Amino acid sequence: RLVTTFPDNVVHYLRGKRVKHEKVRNAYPLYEAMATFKGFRTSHRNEIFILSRAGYAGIQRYAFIWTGDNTPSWDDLKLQLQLVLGLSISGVPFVGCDIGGFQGRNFAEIDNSMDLLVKYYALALFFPFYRSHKATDGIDTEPVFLPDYYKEKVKEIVELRYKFLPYIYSLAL
Amino acid sequence: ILKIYENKGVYKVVIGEPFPPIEFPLEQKISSNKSLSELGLTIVQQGNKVIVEKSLDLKEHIIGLGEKAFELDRKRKRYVMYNVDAGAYKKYQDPLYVSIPLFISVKDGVATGYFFNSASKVIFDVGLEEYDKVIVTIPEDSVEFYVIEGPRIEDVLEKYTELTGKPFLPPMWAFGYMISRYSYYPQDKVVELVDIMQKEGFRVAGVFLDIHYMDSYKLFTWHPYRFPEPKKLIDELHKRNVKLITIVDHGIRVDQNYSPFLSGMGKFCEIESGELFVGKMWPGTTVYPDFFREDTREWWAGLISEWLSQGVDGIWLDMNEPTDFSRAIEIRDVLSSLPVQFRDDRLVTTFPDNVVHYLRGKRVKHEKVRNAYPLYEAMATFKGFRTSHRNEIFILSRAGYAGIQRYAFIWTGDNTPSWDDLKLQLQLVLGLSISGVPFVGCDIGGFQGRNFAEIDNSMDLLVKYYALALFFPFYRSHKATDGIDTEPVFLPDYYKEKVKEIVELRYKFLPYIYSLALEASEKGHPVIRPLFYEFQDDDDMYRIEDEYMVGKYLLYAPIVSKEESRLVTLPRGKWYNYWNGEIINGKSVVKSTHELPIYLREGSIIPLEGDELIVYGETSFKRYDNAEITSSSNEIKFSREIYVSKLTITSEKPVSKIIVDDSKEIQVEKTMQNTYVAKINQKIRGKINLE
């Protein structure tokens, strides 16, 4: 995985000093989010929404964070909980995971069962960020493509979230 | 160049000047007015490629494509059609052993089929490249495909079957319980095992002999030490009323004193440059018969016929993708002592690119006709039975192409035993079934033995395999060499009894299964069917994959988990719980109440072993022996005189008695809710009335 980072000879200009990428790497998304946030200010847009995959201390000033390309499985339910709580206890409040799992069907260890999908919706019931996302080759996970039995379960869960939204948003304040 | 012909709801679209893998007769080939535009298709001819596009709506369902390790609704995936030895395949692996270039679109409840008659590496991009499109790429400059009008899915399959060939009608024993292993030997052990099985109450229809029976894996030979007296083995099995099925690969050993090699000379596959294509297979250095040629087929039929004349009852065609190991072995030779891990690329097991064949006197590249190889081998093998005047034909094949149903059963290959495999196998057999190949099954208990850690050989899982395949046309237990012994007789009493009861239950339903087999050979209707086959207008049905219909009347929701009970989704209409008699209203979810969740829909007639009969609602049914049975207006009519042992009627309204042929009143007994039984035990001239 480290092969996907910037190579060692990349440099940046931080406060008038030429620095190596490896010394300031983790703050890159922070500054990108900062510039993006500034974009909203420039547009005199008061309702701001920015989602970021990476981050560093202070990223909470400008964006929500989701747990990336998770794999749908029963074990992932526990993993996602650790991930979002880890972020939460570390200063990044607005977090969530991809409901239903991101990975589609490019490898065998992917569980696309419908009861698991429902448990994802249920798991994230009170997560700040509530989004369903899927890879290109994944099955359609929108509730409207589910058999009535499962469709109703998702429907009720979502309705329950909206019922509690005022509380959630108060906590956001 | 574009030509379109129409004939009884089938549009034949010809692009350029096609040279089909095989030619399908077209009754009355008549020009059509229908334009590509009115068919909702777009076509593009490029660099030796033909691309056919169709739109794809959000609610549109795409089914078919044969043997695919994916959900039955094929959307959001780019499928490759190329026969290949999949090895220890896992779910979502593509491609596999069989290639049926047919998919059916169900839009607004209306089904339409699309069959591309190319045995090349056809690509079906179902809403992947373009979310709102189905893009089919045929790697040839020309192609012929068919648009098969429905409106019912059954209509499409009937027309498709009419076009590519009706399934042959196999003998009833072909649907019996088959035991197999890789391998059973020597010959005395084979008979010993059959005796123990029979002695303990297992009705074994046949035994499969894997490659260990051959002499150095040479086709049409008996191992001199393990099988000294083959005719003694054959007589011993036959007097025990057990059939013998022998595996037969496609590799001819390059051996100076091996008869088939010498007699086959001149009929083998070659490479571009003119030499014979010499590869590697079980026998070692091997050559392969060019089954695309008529003389090769005639030569092969002769060998099959001679092999059958010893008393062998069936032929099990394996490795016929066709598979070859020369390329893989080459990689191992060169990078042998290198402490590295090789990537497992299954395509490396296909024939190399320079192999050629002679199809209809024309020389063609292997990659253009590859997928049809098993079709032609099966064809030649079938001809072998005809040559032997053998009316009871049994041929099992691993690979296939459109039309393979004319000659053989198909099993899902080297599956890995695990709870997840139960669901995978269901998708595989139903995928084949909805694609024109009715006689299918999987290895009960899983093929993989113990060569890797992710293999679950637990006994309760084994029982669930037997239960899962309860109504599959092909019912066989098969295991790899290093796998534990999975024969029921080696199981503790607790599990042994469970398997025994399941097998007995299958035989109880065999008459129904075989009747559906007859239906399959006459109309091209599949035996086991995904729920959407009978209820294509209900979108919910396209997401139900742990349930399947057995014919038009029986819904089976096998338990595919550790749980003791499962949730059962019932389609529209009324359903009868086979075990407790409860009748439930369709389009609902209920909890199973037995280990084998069976339901009969309202409008069912089911023949059972021992002349038993079950009738629920009104419908018309044809038994395998040609006797038509009708239930309507409280009357059960028979097209001819047939014996009836026990009659079971399921009815919400009470039944006090039945009248046989208007002149004999027979008392009825209510055994449980909505269930009435009448002990008739006699010939019925023509009708039974319910009072």
UniProtKB/Swiss-Prot annotation, chain B:
GO terms for biological process: carbohydrate metabolic process. InterPro entries: Gal_mutarotase_sf_dom, GH31_Enzymes, Glyco_hydro_31_AS, Glyco_hydro_31_C, Glyco_hydro_31_N_dom, Glyco_hydro_31_TIM, Glyco_hydro_b, Glycoside_hydrolase_SF. The keyword Cytoplasm applies. Pfam families: Gal_mutarotas_2 (PF13802), Glyco_hydro_31_2nd (PF01055), Glyco_hydro_31_3rd (PF21365). The keyword Nuclease does not apply. One of its GO terms (molecular function) is hydrolase activity, hydrolyzing O-glycosyl compounds. Its EC number is 3.2.1.20. It is found in: Cytoplasm. Its main location: cytoplasm. Keywords: Cytoplasm, Glycosidase, Hydrolase. The active site is at residues 318, 321, 414. GO terms for cellular component: cytoplasm. It catalyses: Hydrolysis of terminal, non-reducing (1->4)-linked alpha-D-glucose residues with release of alpha-D-glucose. Belongs to the glycosyl hydrolase 31 family. Major soluble alpha-glucosidase. This is Alpha-glucosidase.
